[PDB]
Point group: C2
Chain length 467, copies 2
């Protein structure tokens, strides 16, 4: 007559959920097949004085239950002050650490801080290369992104991005257009090291929050150089190799980068009402510019479909939609043309913003989150990724964040994070008929979650191709 | 087609589980009827430099979903170094904080540090008074326990305990007997305050670990005054009012206190083969002594059955058993006689230690934990509380800690905590046929858990009468 929660877990499979907790200061791996946390780590134990555990991505492991590795980064300084929490810390740490952590079959082991190895500290999205030989991090306080070597944690290339607005006033700096510079960023210290750990490099004193594009324009974000901000978000990888795409929130574009040859090749134009691309101009061997006549909308989330045939960029706030390019020609990204826009009448207000996304392994469906400020219920939209139409929206709870998916394609596992002070949980949805099977405890503020992949192929639908 | 985890929750009822997470630095409330974490708090956010969030207990609320209060304490100093975690903070904050926290129906709000209010800091067990008008804390580094008023957070009474060994050598200091002093503490600062926060008063640098009785005898616990140690653990409450019982680990006795009159009245002797009690001697209006000819075994967990008819004290390590007194005479604890001992062939070695307990509402059964060091399976023993025998033992996983029960008596809800570095979980067992229904994710190193009570009556089986 009693129900055994074990019966629930039995159907999910031998998959390991990993998620960091933002203001909780912790990261945890969970065994979906038993309901046990496998191990957890509190960064404060390692002298971290502002352990805002932000983004993460895990390398493929042949058996996650015996061992896996992952990267998780952190944020600090004034980012401690921007949620509902009445924080009382004098002199927070600066964050921007890039921690390397290994689960050994029993515990998590801190291996090192890659920001100290490389010299470069970055605080927003973390992705793995499709070869699983490296990883990338973006940051929108410094506006730098880089790909790092897995074995030595040294920077393979870093790029730095700057805004030169047509109108020198915060309110019009983006709307009235400008020129973005893409700059090769090279080390300064012995050892080929950067001098950019912690708050070194910050043009603004915290990451822009959702809608925070309005706050910066209204002069309400402090920083040394807000007029120069582009708010880089992510550096996402083409599952086919060669290309990395850096997303830029404030000017509403993506830059496609040639990873091995270390040049940008194409600028994708996000908003409805813009061409497929803007023109990339080379200024010298290390400097490119791109001219943006006006910014119609900021964008945010960016990602490839697991076969690399589609590239997506979400417009956010001013427009709320999913922009889709035909990325089928792997040879030449200057040829990638817009082929669809996903819209809904639901999406006409400032909110919801269409954010984190995961594809099914066959690329036929996507799960994309719908984020709102308190107190509107946040949730998940099911998208037909062949016709480019919304199939359904399901309502979940406050502050929906990331989605991941079991590699068999059967279950979408996401996190809700309570705006750091309220309801938080793991959500499980089956993808056969798109029903929510329900919620597991998760006393954490997650802005990321992955399922540990086993193979290079699994990476195509983990934290590699999308955020 | 699919199993919905919701169906598991449906059967549990509208109950709220709260637990702190020791090295996770966090405390979290969880809704058993949905699987959601309702709210969590990270003490680092408040500039707590050693948030070892240790014990806790919750006041009754008419509707815990709309609001409840709770007390959670912390530890610090060298307690940070006692797990397998390679902690890197060499000089941690002192801990001993006594946090008052209110869940307000949406978030957890830190209300104050009662140790700063009162001036007294204590790091081990926290219990609620049976009137819910106050709480108590004990501490085995400074050997002080106290009952505090709920409204002002000021000390009603505090008692300090001190050991004077027959033989002045740590190996023999307890086995060859001695005199324990029970001393009334008075405030020494302006404003009714004590001067006992943080490390002030410590005789030893960390709380004795399970087995730690041997380590202190072997000279291996550093400290100003280890020959004077008694390792106070708790102050538990008679559900009938009037009496409080302080447990002393090293000399293996419990002291019964008259709460309203602020005198000790009786000393109960723990080990199998000692009398019911030892003789309390009054020295002056603030000083009592008790002479202990030899200490046969240290003890640990102490608690009353919910009707107050039985009082239990566990012997641990040298003997492993449950000592039981007849406490039916509410008017005179000098009359309380040993009436039974629960033993098992199961309990043969040094380990398991039987460490935490919860009763059924009708007092007919008790659930008690079985703790071992890694890696032996830890678990739960079901005790017939009428005939005083072990009914059943179930194996669960690593590092079993506390037990609570839903107030309808239907489900035992415990925590397992991975020795701070490995697997951790919430466990649910039904009490009708004593089967483990399964586990829930819990990325915390819990040393305590409660279900938020609704009435004074519920308190008799919560963190008030037992630990
Ligand atoms: Cu992002
Ligand atoms: Cu974030
Ligand atoms: Cu105890
Ligand atoms: Cu403890």
């Amino acid at each position: 007559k009693y129900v055994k929660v074990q019966d629930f877990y039995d159907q999910l499979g031998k998959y390991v959920l990993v998620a960091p907790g933002k203001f909780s200061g912790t990261v945890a791996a969970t065994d979906l097949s038993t309901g046990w946390t496998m191990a957890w780590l509190a960064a404060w134990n390692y002298g971290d004085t502002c352990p805002i555990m932000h983004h993460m991505a895990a390398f493929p492991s042949p058996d996650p239950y015996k061992e896996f590795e992952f990267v998780v980064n952190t944020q600090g300084g004034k980012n401690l002050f921007i949620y509902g929490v009445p924080v009382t810390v004098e002199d927070p740490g600066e964050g921007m650490k890039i921690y390397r952590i290994k689960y050994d079959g029993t515990r998590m082991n801190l291996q090192r801080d890659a920001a100290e190895v490389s010299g470069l500290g970055l605080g927003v999205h973390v992705t793995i290369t499709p070869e699983a030989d490296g990883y990338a991090v973006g940051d929108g306080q410094k506006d730098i992104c880089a790909e790092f070597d897995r074995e030595t944690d040294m920077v393979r290339y870093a790029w730095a991005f700057d805004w030169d607005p047509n109108v020198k006033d915060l309110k019009r700096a983006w709307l009235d257009g400008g020129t973005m510079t893409i700059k090769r960023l090279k080390p300064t210290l012995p050892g080929g090291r950067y001098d950019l750990q912690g708050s070194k490099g910050n043009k603004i004193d915290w990451e822009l929050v959702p809608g925070g594009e309005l706050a910066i324009e209204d002069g309400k974000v402090s920083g040394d150089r807000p007029l120069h901000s582009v708010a880089n978000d992510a550096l996402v990888f083409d599952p086919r190799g060669k290309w990395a795409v850096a997303s830029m929130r404030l000017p509403g574009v993506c830059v496609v980068f040639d990873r091995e040859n270390q040049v940008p090749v194409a600028v994708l134009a996000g908003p409805k009402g813009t061409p497929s691309q803007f023109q990339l101009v080379k200024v010298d061997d290390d400097t490119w510019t791109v001219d943006i006549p006006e910014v119609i909308s900021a964008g945010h989330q960016a990602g490839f479909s697991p076969d690399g045939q589609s590239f997506l960029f979400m417009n956010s706030l001013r427009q709320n939609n999913i922009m889709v390019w035909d990325s089928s020609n792997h040879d030449d990204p200057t040829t990638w043309e817009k082929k669809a826009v996903v819209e809904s009448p639901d999406w006409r207000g400032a909110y919801p913003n269409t954010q984190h996304m995961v594809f099914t392994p066959d690329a036929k469906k996507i799960y994309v989150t719908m984020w709102w400020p308190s107190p509107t219920p946040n949730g998940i939209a099911v998208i037909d990724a062949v016709n480019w139409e919304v199939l359904k929206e399901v309502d979940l709870g406050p502050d929906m964040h990331t989605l991941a998916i079991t590699y068999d394609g059967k279950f979408v596992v996401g996190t809700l994070s309570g705006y750091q002070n309220t309801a938080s949980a793991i959500v499980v949805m089956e993808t056969e008929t798109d029903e929510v099977l329900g919620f597991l405890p998760s006393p954490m503020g997650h802005h990321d979650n992955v399922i540990v992949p086993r193979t290079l192929e699994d990476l195509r639908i983990s934290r590699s191709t999308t955020t």
